[model samples]
Target chain A: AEIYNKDGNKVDLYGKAVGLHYFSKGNGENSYGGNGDMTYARLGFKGETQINSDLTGYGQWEYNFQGNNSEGADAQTGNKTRLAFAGLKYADVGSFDYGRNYGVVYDALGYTDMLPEFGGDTAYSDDFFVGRVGGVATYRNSNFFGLVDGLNFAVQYLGKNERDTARRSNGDGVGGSISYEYEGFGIVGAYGAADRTNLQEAQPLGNGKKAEQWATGLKYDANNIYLAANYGETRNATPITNKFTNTSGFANKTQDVLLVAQYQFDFGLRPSIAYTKSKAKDVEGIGDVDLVNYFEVGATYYFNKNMSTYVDYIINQIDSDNKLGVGSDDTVAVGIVYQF
Target chain B: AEIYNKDGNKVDLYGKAVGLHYFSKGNGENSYGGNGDMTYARLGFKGETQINSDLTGYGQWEYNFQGNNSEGADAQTGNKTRLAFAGLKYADVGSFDYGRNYGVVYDALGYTDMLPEFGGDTAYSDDFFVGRVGGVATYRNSNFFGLVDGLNFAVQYLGKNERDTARRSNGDGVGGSISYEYEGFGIVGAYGAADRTNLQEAQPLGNGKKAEQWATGLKYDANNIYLAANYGETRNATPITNKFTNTSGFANKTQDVLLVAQYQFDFGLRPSIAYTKSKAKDVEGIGDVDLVNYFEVGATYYFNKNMSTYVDYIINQIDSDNKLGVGSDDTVAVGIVYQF
Candidate 1:
């Protein structure tokens, strides 16, 4: 609701709440938990004020709650350092934003992360995506080349001092993405890189090494069915650890491939399945590890568009001969999501 | 107004942003800070759905921004671990919810904690109240046992394993309160208890032990003036300790009493004053301590229902013989609040 609307300015409060019951078993432990899978049960406030006829000023504060309570089905509960930023938009030109947000590379890779599990999820392996970058600037234009209606592009930049002055370099990088869609199909490509010195010295990541990613994806929608796939590769990115298996060796290079398909039924039910694989090589002293495979199947039953129940199961495994010696893990989850 | 409405299901977003300029001096430090006081700069999303005419489903996510920028009059800014929950409500059967929310005991004590400062604020003593409890099941009934039209009651519960398995107990507790209003007079009483082990073991309080509280309050509103008073006591709660004070001895018991009076002027101005006292006895080895007295006075100017400004000052002092060896402290705060 626009609680305040004056002239051409408007303000509104918005948010979503999603909770799930999750259970998993790996090796010797049976772990059960509840989590807020959708934006971590977040709330946001946003508004735009007219600045002349073709420009507007806007800002938003989006935060997530992080706390865990299995019985009460509470997971994302407590102090979340989430998204915070502000920007300006021009009616015919484009839009620009600053602060913490998705880097251009991640935006280009968005289509492939739509699945409930393992569809280019960066949390599993940095090799799949360049997620949020703090202290960054972004710009987007729908008709930058003035070529066609579906052509769009985005660019992002980060400062060498984005993190702190004490740091030698703060993961500074610059990149962009381009996409086009016609009929019922679309394609997207993105690339980004950070200075090598900053990568090996960053405080939070501590991996502090030169890193880069390039990804491209395609999607098609027809009838009530949707299909999508993406392939990406990362150079000199750290290997994911403590998640699916025991893999802990760094990869000199890694590649990811993902595929997803979903069909909506007339009776409020939508079912989908996905598969993702990560292949790593030059793992520090170890040459390579067997490819890690992740498979997911899930469905959503909508009471209506505003609310629904979702269920998903995932199996993550690696070859036993893999250098990291990681074991397979399985997880099951179900929850309800409501948006307003 | 519902931003999105279809098929009798309505969704609306709501929230308030409040910021305060706070300054205080105690012991050897003169400190200044900005805080989200009254509404805690919170954002919330609420919606209800029909499930058979009299039954409905509802849910909400509330969060507070904790960042503080003292110089810019910016209070709400950072990561927040707030409240999230969902429930079902019956037109004639009250409501049931499971999640993190205020305890029933705190609900009953609400009338006394309305002051800008120092009316049973547990953050200061750790001995006065049981605040928000996680993994909680709460119920509220307005018709309240068919007692009367203005009668209402609330009940809440926390599980033994609600917190974490590593703890001796998860601060599990159950409590309820009932309040009734007749004409311009109202009265409320509440009681609650948490396992002692959890009390002393909880990370924040570290007082692990058996703890309990009982409180009663009364308020009267007539003409342009309002008056209220409350009395409560706690047993085996940890005595508050701080860097400036050597109050390491736990209080065997503590008692609190508060009184408040306020008058509203016809010119959109309201001024209020309050006084509270805390008496502790049976300190670990120091025995009885002098009562701690807190006095607060504040005034609010309302430009309209959607906007306002507030100013408040507080004085906290203890007569010499305080076991904690704490002295007097003073605070001044002022701020503007806008709601959209």
Candidate 2:
């Protein structure tokens, strides 16, 4: 919480508040499953000023809230949006912005979905590059421009909403990402392609035929010991579910993998483990499909730097022949957090 | 922008960013009219702490932003919500809260809508009390609780959202307000009644029959001259329009009045003038209509504290018999704002 700095300006205020729960049944894709209100809260604001000495100007907004619902568990009770944007920066020769962000291929699958609760189920939001979508326009450059250090890069442009329902219509796109880090060890990749709105090529789940995706990743976090992995692919973007007929489809080619490990104790515990797999290739007549095969475990217990408590555990490893379902359920999520 | 404080907590961050435009055709009730992006922006966050000495606790969240719309102005490209709440207090023995706010009859019509640009047209937002709506729960008490210095009061409760249909579901309501002040001279009043669900009584414009409203107002400011006046009434709640034909209904009874005057020039401009009227009674087939009669003028210039600029002029005097229309239009607004 920086609030505001002075003349040159700066402002910040992050968020967090979870008071989650779920013992099974289902959730996500618009909330639900027992003891209403999975409790969620978020708030954000960010600012930056100083437009000289190498420029600067920034903005951000974030929101989300969900607490009461279920006139019989029919809750989403309204309030959403994950981020908004504004940009301009110069030092290191990068920075420029647009609205609704995230999606430079989620910088290579958001590094193993950090399981504090099911993390990055392989990038979701409005397709095309997997995660938070909406007319983009970005540009980034880090160490590489400061003369190679942890070398970094980004470029993006996505615009085309054409929706009246083609389900998250999409058409114009372009994406990029590349990364590298030295000591703590890291490597990354990302890619994207788009074009599909003609009402998403006349829906029939043959959705925006031009959609595409790619990813690659690796990460390590030094002594506190954390390891992550990623592997991705998509052809028609993604959105699949059938898990015993919850229906929903689109994925002509898919492939996924993730592996995570964590440990950080010294008191404020932290333990995690993960494994995931996704597949859906050829399927005009169900050739191959198993949207996700899971295994996740969690632990978090920090009550110091802004509270915490958690327990996530899901271990559904595809069954019923994995009927093209990624709707896995086998829940147990107990959280309580408070971030800043 | 306070951001955050320590121990006794305290956060802050307000908002504004306008950059508006409108030559008049319409804009609101979900945006539109002329050039895209009637720009908008808002962000909020508030925090308070100190749970000792005399107790305290607070919370708030705000959001709204719209720009770049009109794939034929289908503006409202989504993102809305005016506030969220949380509360506790005891200094003067008042304060308690809930989510979504405002509505205690907008403390007597928000004191004549303060013409910064067409101010309060008899309140709008889920109609149960004429403004901002949502499952409320509030309690306020100011001066009176502090030994009757200038008196003030409030009470509210609203809840019930039966919607799978039923525009802005509402029912189970309660409201209150009362005020008095000295020195700068002020007076206020408010009232409410609610019970309108059953899908708003099977919508056909006959709405849930037990809605009610009341208001009273008067105001004054020392030296810089600012005057205000208000009068109100409603039954079956408000919402009307035909505006040469824009259709939209729901007003079984109504009456309104507002008058404003402003002047404040110590260089930083601030000129305003206003008059308003509303009517819509009888009318099962149109009896007393004329949803509004307008006259407004504006001027705001303050390039110091934060920033500002303005120009508003609306002057539509009921035409074509002002058929149950409050969709008054006759615009000209040029704004630019910035706030913190």
Candidate 3:
């Protein structure tokens, strides 16, 4: 909420309390616990001041609380810094941001990533590839070409820690994404690469063992219905078999595809279903690969736009051989989310 | 406060930013660090809609920001989740709330618990006994029996977690409290108990160990002067020595008492003093359990009702023998707290 707005300068207070009652049984273990699992309990402060008529200066600080501790424990006592960044935006040029922010490539997964559960995979993207990158700078534009009404792009550079020695794995990386939307249809493409270093210690392969990814997605939303699909692949310079044995075929490679569909009802409820499939290939020890499939069904009830609750069930089906370290599992979760 | 209140619906935004510079020296260790001590930074969102003339549906989501990370580290990154709950209220029927919330037992200590440093004994009334309870439900009434004004009561039930198994050690608990205020005088009493479980794994004893607490307090405020006193005791069902050896007696039982006095000056500053004493007896290996005596002096300068700064110093005097594992320690802290 904007608590203050005067003379082209504004400050907003934003936050949410999101928690879940999660129950799951898998791998001979079951946990029915309460968690601030989805968005966590988060708070943020943001402000913007007009530097001029065409430019503005802005910054934000965001933090999250851990409300899941057991009895006889401290409350909201832990680190959970989310974003701390400053930037400048221009009317005709673009915007430049410095500090911690999401990787550009991860933004391309927007289409199929909206589901409450599942469908957030981008190639083999994990923290190093898709999570927030520190000590980085980014530039973004909503009208990259100025020829179309719905065109945007963002580029980011991941820098190394100044204290990181040359022999260390703390190297550098770059990522970017471009997207266009017309009417109710949208499409996006993204790519990212990280310099090879001692970082992936397990990967005995030395320099040139870089990690790379490419992804594209499409989505449509109209008439209270939404649909999205995305596909991407990731490759490691080191052969997957080399990490397990002397035999080597192709390098470590993983491909992923996700699909989602949802419809909002006039009665303040939205039901969504999502499916994801992941495949790995070219391994030295394993035979032909069998894919792993994940399916999720969920519904959200809106007490109002500012408050809502969700119930979701997820099922995981894996190949019997279990070569991918995948195992069958089931989970059900109910959550309450609110924004103020 | 009310950032948005339109068309019979309202949304309120609230938060506080508190930070402290702490310098302490204790048994074999000392720390000169910054902390979000006392009252950590927190943010909250709440909303209410008039269900009718005498009823309302309201909910609140609050989270804390651990902005006091050590220097050269992420300021707020870790588990710090706080309160997330929803409830309904009636003008005459009171309220019912479900989810994680504070135990009623802790409310009785409200008077002496306001100190920024010292005098909040948990083993007797916090965490295991009176702190926040997860997977719980609470009911409260501000006008108990409608017999008189300023009379209120609360009850709570801790539900068993379906995921908690014999190996996990999580169980359940219950708590309740009653209070009355009139003519600048107030009194309160509370009780709480936790089921025998492994949740207290840190405690050496293996099984049949339950935690229980009882407390009472009184306070008076008038003529710019306030005074309060509190007493509480905690006991474990299993003999305290069972976790150790046959050398036991009552060493496992603990009792605490605290007293505080404060005067608000015509000036903007308020000076306060507090004293706390703790005693434990009947232990297998220890004698003379005088425990520790703590004394604190502090002053708060209020810039406004929403902003203030405090300077406090606490002195701990322990039995020279240190049989209670108590040692002389000193702490000085300066802090700033602001709410918007």
| Best candidate (score: DockQ) | 3
Give lDDT: candidate 2, residue A141. Answer: 92
lDDT of 1 by residue, A1-340 (tens): 3456778888866665664445555312322122222223656678899999878899877766643332122333354545678999887689999976766777556776766433556433112236654657888888664556888898887655432332223456777788888887989998877655443443322243666777888998778888888887877654544244433334567777778888889888888888877777765455566555777788877765455667887766555555554545566776556655
Best prediction by lDDT: 2
lDDT of 3 at B146: 62
Q: Score the docking of each candidate (DockQ).
A: 0.12, 0.02, 0.25
Q: Which stretches of candidate 2 lie over 4 Å from their true place?
A: A1-12, A15-80, A83-122, A127-163, A167-201, A204-228, A231-250, A257-340, B1-105, B108-237, B241-252, B255-280, B284-340
Q: Please, what are the lDDT tens digits per residue for candidate 3 over residues A232-338?
A: 77665322333224432233566778899899899888898998876666543564453447787888877665656788777665544555344455667776665
Scanning candidate 1 chain B in windows of ten residues, the lowest lDDT window is: B27-36
lDDT of 2 by residue, A30-125 (tens): 221233346778877676666467766666666676664555544444555555666666798888676666789898888887788776776886
Docking class of 2: incorrect
Candidate 3 achieves a global lDDT of 0.64
Tell me the docking grade of candidate 3. acceptable
lDDT of 1 at A223: 81
Model 2: how far is A154 from its true place, Å? 32
lDDT of 1: 0.62
